[PDB]
Short mmCIF file of C-alpha atoms and ligand atoms in Angstrom, two decimals:
data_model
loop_
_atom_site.label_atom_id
_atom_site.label_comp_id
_atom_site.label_asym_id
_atom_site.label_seq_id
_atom_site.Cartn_x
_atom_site.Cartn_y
_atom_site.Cartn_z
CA UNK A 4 -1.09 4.30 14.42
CA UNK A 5 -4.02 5.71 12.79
CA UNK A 6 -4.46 3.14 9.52
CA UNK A 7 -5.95 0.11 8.73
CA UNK A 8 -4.59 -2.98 6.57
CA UNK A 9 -6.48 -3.63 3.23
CA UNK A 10 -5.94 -6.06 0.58
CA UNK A 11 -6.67 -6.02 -3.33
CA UNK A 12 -5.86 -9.36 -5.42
CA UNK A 13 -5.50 -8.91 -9.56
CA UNK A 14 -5.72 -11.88 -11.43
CA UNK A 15 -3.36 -11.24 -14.30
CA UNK A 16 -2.71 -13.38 -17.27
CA UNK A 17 -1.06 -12.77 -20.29
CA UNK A 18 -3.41 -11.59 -22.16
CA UNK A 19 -6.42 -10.67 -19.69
CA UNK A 20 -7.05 -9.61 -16.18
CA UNK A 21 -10.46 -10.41 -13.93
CA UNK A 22 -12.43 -7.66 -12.30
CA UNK A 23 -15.59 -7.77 -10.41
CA UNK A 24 -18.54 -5.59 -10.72
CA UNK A 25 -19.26 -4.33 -7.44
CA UNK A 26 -22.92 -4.54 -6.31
CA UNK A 27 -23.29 -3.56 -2.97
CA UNK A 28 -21.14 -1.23 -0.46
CA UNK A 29 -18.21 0.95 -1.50
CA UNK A 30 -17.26 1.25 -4.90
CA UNK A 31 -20.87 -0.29 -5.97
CA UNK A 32 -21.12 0.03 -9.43
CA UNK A 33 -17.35 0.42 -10.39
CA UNK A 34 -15.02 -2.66 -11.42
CA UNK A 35 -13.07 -3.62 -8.52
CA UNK A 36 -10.03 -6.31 -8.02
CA UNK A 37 -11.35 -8.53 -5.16
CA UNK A 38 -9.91 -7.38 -1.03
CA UNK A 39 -11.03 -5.69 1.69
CA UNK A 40 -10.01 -5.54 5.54
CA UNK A 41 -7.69 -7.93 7.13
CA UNK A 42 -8.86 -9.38 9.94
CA UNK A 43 -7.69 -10.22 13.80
CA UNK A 44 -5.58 -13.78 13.21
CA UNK A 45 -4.80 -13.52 9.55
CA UNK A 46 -1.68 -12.40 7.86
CA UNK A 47 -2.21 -9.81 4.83
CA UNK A 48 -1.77 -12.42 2.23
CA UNK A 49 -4.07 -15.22 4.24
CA UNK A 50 -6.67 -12.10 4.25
CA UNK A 51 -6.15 -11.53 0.44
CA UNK A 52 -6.89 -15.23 -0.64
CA UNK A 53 -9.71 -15.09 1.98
CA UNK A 54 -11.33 -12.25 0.03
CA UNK A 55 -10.94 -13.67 -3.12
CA UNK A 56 -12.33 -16.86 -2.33
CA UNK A 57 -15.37 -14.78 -0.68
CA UNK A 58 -15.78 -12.62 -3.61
CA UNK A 59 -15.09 -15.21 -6.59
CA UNK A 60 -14.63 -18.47 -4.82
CA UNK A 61 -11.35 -18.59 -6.76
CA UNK A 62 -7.88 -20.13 -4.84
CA UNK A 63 -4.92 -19.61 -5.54
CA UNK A 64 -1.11 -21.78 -5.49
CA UNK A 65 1.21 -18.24 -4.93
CA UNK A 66 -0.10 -14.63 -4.59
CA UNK A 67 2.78 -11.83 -5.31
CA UNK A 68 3.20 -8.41 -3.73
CA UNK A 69 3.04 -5.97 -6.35
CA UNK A 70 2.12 -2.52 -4.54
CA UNK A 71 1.40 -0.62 -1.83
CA UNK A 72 -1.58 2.17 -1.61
CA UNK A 73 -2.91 4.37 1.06
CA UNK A 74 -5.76 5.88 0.69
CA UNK A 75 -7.15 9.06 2.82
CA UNK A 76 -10.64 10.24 3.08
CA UNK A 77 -11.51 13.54 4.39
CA UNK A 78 -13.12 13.23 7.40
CA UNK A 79 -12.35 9.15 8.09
CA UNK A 80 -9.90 9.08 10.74
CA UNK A 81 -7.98 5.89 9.68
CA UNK A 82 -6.05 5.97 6.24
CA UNK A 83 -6.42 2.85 4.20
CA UNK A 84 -3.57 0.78 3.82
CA UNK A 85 -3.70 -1.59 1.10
CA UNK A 86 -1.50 -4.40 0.04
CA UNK A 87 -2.00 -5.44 -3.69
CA UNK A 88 -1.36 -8.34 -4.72
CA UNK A 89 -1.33 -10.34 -8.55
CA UNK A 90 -1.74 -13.96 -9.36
CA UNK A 91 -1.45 -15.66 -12.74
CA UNK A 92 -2.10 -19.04 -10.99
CA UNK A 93 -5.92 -19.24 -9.88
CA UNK A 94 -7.76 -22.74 -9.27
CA UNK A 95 -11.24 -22.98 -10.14
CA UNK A 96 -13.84 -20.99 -12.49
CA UNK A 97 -14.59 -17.40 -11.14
CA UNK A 98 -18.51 -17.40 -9.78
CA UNK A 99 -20.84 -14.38 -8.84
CA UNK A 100 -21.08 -13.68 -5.04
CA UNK A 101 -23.17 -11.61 -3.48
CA UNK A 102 -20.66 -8.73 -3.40
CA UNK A 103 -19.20 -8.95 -6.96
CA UNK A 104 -19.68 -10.53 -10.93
CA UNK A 105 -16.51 -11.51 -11.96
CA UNK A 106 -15.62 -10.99 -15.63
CA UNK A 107 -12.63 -11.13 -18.15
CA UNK A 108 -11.04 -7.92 -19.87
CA UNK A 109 -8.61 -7.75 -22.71
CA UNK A 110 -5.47 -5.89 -21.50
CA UNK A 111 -6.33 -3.04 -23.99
CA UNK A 112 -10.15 -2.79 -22.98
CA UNK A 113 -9.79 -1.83 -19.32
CA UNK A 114 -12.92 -0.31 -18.43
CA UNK A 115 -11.45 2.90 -16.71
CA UNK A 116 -14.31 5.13 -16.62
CA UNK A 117 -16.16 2.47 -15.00
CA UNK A 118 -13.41 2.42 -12.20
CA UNK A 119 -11.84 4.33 -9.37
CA UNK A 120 -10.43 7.21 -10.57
CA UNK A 121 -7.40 6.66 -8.77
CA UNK A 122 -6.90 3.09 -11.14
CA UNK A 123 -6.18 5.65 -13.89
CA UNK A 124 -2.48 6.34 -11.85
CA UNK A 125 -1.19 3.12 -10.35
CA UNK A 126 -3.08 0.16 -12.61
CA UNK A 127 -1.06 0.64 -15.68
CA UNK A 128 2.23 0.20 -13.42
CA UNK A 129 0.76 -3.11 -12.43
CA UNK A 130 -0.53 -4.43 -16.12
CA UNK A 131 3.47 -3.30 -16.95
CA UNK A 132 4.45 -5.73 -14.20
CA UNK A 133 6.19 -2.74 -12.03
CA UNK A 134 5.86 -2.48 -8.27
CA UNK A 135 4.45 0.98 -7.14
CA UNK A 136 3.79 3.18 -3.76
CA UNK A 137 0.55 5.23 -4.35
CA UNK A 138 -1.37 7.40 -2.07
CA UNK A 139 -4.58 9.37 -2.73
CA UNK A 140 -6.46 11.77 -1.31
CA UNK A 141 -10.22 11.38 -1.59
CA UNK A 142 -13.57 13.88 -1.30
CA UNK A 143 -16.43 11.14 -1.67
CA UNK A 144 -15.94 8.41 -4.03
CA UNK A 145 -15.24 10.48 -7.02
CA UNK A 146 -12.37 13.42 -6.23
CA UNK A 147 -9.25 12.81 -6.31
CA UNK A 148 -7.33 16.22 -4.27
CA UNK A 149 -3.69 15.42 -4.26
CA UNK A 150 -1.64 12.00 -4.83
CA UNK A 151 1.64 10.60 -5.07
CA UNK A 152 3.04 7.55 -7.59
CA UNK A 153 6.38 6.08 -7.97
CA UNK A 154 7.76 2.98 -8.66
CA UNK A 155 9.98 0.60 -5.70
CA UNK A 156 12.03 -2.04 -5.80
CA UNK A 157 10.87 -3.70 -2.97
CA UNK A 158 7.22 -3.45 -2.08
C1 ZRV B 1 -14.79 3.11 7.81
C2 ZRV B 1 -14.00 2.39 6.75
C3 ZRV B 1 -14.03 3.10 5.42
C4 ZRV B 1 -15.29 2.83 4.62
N1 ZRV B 1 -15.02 2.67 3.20
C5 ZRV B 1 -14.32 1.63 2.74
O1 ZRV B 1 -14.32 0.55 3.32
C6 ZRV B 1 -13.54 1.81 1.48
C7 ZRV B 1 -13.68 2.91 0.63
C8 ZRV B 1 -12.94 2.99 -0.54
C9 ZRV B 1 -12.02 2.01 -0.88
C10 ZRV B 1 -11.27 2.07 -2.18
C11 ZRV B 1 -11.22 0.93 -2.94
C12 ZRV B 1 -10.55 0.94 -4.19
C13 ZRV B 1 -10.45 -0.20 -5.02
N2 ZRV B 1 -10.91 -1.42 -4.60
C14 ZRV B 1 -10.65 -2.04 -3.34
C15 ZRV B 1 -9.62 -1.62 -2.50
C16 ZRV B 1 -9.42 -2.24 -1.28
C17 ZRV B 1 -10.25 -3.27 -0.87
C18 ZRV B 1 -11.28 -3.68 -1.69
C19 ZRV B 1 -11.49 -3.07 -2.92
C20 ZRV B 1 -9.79 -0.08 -6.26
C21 ZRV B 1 -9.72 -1.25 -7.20
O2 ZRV B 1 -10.31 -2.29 -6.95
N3 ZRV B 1 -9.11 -1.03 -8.37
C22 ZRV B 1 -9.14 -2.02 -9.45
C23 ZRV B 1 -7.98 -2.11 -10.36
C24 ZRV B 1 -8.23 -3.18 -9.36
C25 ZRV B 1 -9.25 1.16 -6.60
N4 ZRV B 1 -9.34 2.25 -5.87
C26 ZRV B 1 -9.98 2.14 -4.66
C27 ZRV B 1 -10.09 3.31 -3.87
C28 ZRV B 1 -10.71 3.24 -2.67
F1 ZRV B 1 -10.78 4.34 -1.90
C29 ZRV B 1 -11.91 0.89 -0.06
C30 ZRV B 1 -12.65 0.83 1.10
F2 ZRV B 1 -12.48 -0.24 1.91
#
């Protein structure tokens, strides 16, 4: 039973996706999607719009399921289990939270070496609208030891 639920919410459009700059607490100073832990009471997808409306104070009509990650840390007990999710159809103007600064990229100026390593793997699969099962081994925030990556039909 050791893991814990996580969410991660892309907003996607046709021609550009939204990341936030992260500006306090893990993955400070990389560009994250907007998630974290789901909570006691909430489903997975009631967690993910809660985060996103924390983080950007964006809503959202329909959130899909587009992946599935765990992540392992050496040394943290519980593996990270986290449901992504992608929207085209957000409500509102992103705004800067305390957390994260929202901003617009181009689908062919994805700041990757401002990113988790890991986003290298399993992002591309979501820009090319596959659903994917990733896991990845970490050693701080910057080593990645061993992974796996495919693609599923059902998430
Ligand atoms: C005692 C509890 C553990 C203390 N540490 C943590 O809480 C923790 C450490 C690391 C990560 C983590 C986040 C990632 C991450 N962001 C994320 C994931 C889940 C919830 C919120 C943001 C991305 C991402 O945003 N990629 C961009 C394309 C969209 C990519 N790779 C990631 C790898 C990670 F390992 C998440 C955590 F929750």
């Amino acid at each position: 039973g050791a893991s814990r639920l996580y969410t991660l919410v892309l907003v996607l459009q046709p021609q550009r996706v939204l990341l936030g700059m992260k500006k306090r607490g893990f993955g400070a100073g990389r560009w994250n999607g907007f998630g974290g832990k789901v909570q006691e009471g909430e489903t997975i997808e009631d967690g993910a719009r809660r985060e996103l409306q924390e983080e950007s104070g964006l809503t959202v009509d329909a959130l899909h399921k587009v992946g599935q990650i765990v992540f392992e840390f050496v040394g943290e007990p519980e593996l990270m289990d986290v449901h992504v999710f992608c929207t085209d159809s957000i409500q509102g103007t992103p705004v800067e939270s305390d957390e994260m600064r929202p901003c617009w990229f181009q689908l062919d100026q994805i700041p990757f070496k401002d990113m988790w390593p890991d986003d290298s793997y399993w992002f591309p699969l979501l820009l090319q609208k596959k659903k994917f099962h990733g896991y990845f081994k970490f050693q701080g925030q910057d080593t990645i030891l061993d992974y796996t990556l495919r693609e599923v039909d059902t998430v």
